[PDB]
Amino acid sequence: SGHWGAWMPSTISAFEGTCVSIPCRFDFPDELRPAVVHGVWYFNSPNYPPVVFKSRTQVVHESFQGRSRLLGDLGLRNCTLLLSTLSPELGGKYYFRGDLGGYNQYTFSEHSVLDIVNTPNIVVPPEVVAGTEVEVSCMVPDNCPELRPELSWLGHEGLGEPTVLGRLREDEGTWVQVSLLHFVPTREANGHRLGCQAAFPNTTLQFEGYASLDVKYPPVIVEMNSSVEAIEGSHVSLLCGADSNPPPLLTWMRDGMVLREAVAKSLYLDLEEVTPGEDGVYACLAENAYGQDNRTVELSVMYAAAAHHH
Ligand SMILES: *[C@@H]1O[C@H](CO)[C@@H](O[C@@H]2O[C@H](CO)[C@@H](O[C@@H]3O[C@H](CO[C@H]4O[C@H](CO)[C@@H](O)[C@H](O[C@H]5O[C@H](CO)[C@@H](O)[C@H](O)[C@@H]5O)[C@@H]4O)[C@@H](O)[C@H](O)[C@@H]3O)[C@H](O)[C@H]2NC(C)=O)[C@H](O)[C@H]1NC(C)=O
Ligand SMILES: *[C@@H]1O[C@H](CO)[C@@H](O)[C@H](O)[C@H]1NC(C)=O
Ligand SMILES: *[C@@H]1O[C@H](CO)[C@@H](O)[C@H](O)[C@H]1NC(C)=O
Ligand SMILES: *[C@@H]1O[C@H](CO)[C@@H](O)[C@H](O)[C@H]1NC(C)=O
Ligand SMILES: *[C@H]1O[C@H](CO)[C@@H](O)[C@H](O)[C@@H]1O
């Protein structure tokens, strides 16, 4: 109580070409009773930081000229800063310095890191599995009073209609715009391109961000031979194809014995000089981390080989 100190969000973000208001409050010993309260805003991009604002001499660095103005009264312990027409160069650390005349100048420790962005924020859970309810969100910074972002999805036709949460508060007292997608994805939703757009009315500013859904799903054996009727002594190739994400482990088996095994989309089982001893049921097993599938095929050597003398 009645102490040198400041209060501002450690981090804050805004769209390139827009504005940002950095909420700021500072305090000082009440015993001072200054007739006039002065202040200085400094900028550190990565020992001579450019001056954003300085009430004393009204000096403004060229990078901030006509792009920065102090909001709120310093006499009311309110050092809120507005930065306008933002460009990537303005990204960095901002800190405030109090000046109550005499030797009562004070550079406050707490600062604010401004992040300037050009794409909306799409949040997708690290593991998306088919058959489970999934939430996807588009987040957008909302710290510009003069310009409000309109949020919209791109290529969301198969995922259902969005649910707009609106302006939400995050930590440090900053704001975001959030829109949601709640859906149960099938295997078809794998690779689906998801896009979000942040547009500002009465401007030409339009920001787009895209992401691709990685949908995991169990194997479905889609390629499989029908009942094989082979010629004596011929060559027989059995093919088992499987569709899964991630790619499946394919296993050819007969009589409880693994004939061939490989992590692939398709797996061939080659039988040479086919004899009646090769007759029987062959099984193809497909499995990944999310499920399994299996089919069988009966091999029948029912065609006698013709003699071959020339
Ligand atoms: C330190 O000083 C700073 C600056 O002096 C103070 O910050 C200001 O505080 C005042 C309150 O004293 C605020 O003024 C209020 O603003 C409210 C804003 O809400 C409406 O107005 C907007 C107009 O641009 C409008 O966008 C908004 O949303 C509408 O549009 C959206 C899309 O267009 C849509 O999503 C919405 O649903 C809605 O339709 C609202 O309608 C307003 O409601 C109040 O009546 C009052 O005017 C300033 O905005 C603050 N300025 C800044 C830069 O933050 C700060 O409080 C001081 N600190 C202390 C401790 O005193
Ligand atoms: C946006 O509207 C403001 C007033 O609300 C006006 O000053 C400005 O010129 C407009 N910008 C454009 C590009 O029309
Ligand atoms: C099984 O099917 C694959 C692909 O359709 C084919 O290449 C292969 O020759 C077939 N096997 C037999 C014995 O016909
Ligand atoms: C093959 O799949 C069926 C269900 O599709 C299952 O009941 C059976 O146990 C599976 N067989 C093997 C060997 O995994
Ligand atoms: C600011 O200056 C020093 C900082 O410790 C103290 O005398 C006191 O906190 C004052 O507010």
Author numbering: 19 to 64, 68 to 331
Please quote the authors directly.
MAG is a type 1 single-pass transmembrane protein expressed on myelinating oligodendrocytes in the CNS and Schwann cells in the PNS23. Myelin-associated glycoprotein (MAG) adhesion and signalling at the myelin–axon interface regulates the formation and maintenance of myelinated axons, thus playing an important role in the development and function of the nervous system. MAG adhesion maintains the myelin–axon spacing (periaxonal diameter) by interacting with specific neuronal gangliosides (glycolipids), such as the major brain gangliosides GT1b and GD1a. On the basis of the primary sequence its extracellular region is predicted to consist of five Ig domains; an N-terminal V-type Ig domain that is typical for Siglecs and four C2-type Ig domains.
In addition, crystals of a shorter construct, consisting of the three N-terminal domains (MAG1–3), diffracted to a maximum resolution of 2.1 Å. In all three crystal forms MAG has an extended collinear conformation. Only consecutive Ig domains interact with each other via hydrophobic interfaces (buried-surface area ranging from 243 to 690 Å2) and short inter-domain linkers of up to two residues. Domains Ig1 and Ig2 form the largest interface in which the Ig2 loops at the N-terminal ‘head' side interact with the A2-B (Ig domain β–strand numbering) side of Ig1. In all three crystal forms, electron density proximal to the side chain of W22 suggests this residue is C-mannosylated. The W22-attached α-D-mannopyranosyl group has an unusual ring-flipped 1C4 chair conformation in the structures (regular mannose is 4C1). We do not observe clear electron density for any ligands in the two other crystal forms (lysine-methylated MAG1–5 and MAG1–3). In these crystal forms the unliganded MAG is apparently preferentially crystallized over the ligand-bound forms. The other glycans are not expected to interfere with dimerization, also not when considering myelin-specific N-linked glycans. We confirmed that MAG dimerizes in solution via the Ig4–Ig5 interface by analysing glycosylated and deglycosylated forms of MAG1–5, MAG1–3 (that lacks the dimerization domains) and the aforementioned mutants in small angle X-ray scattering (SAXS) and AUC experiments. Similar to the SAXS analysis, the MAG1–5 I473E and MAG1–3 SE-AUC data fit best to a single species that agrees with the Mm of a monomer.
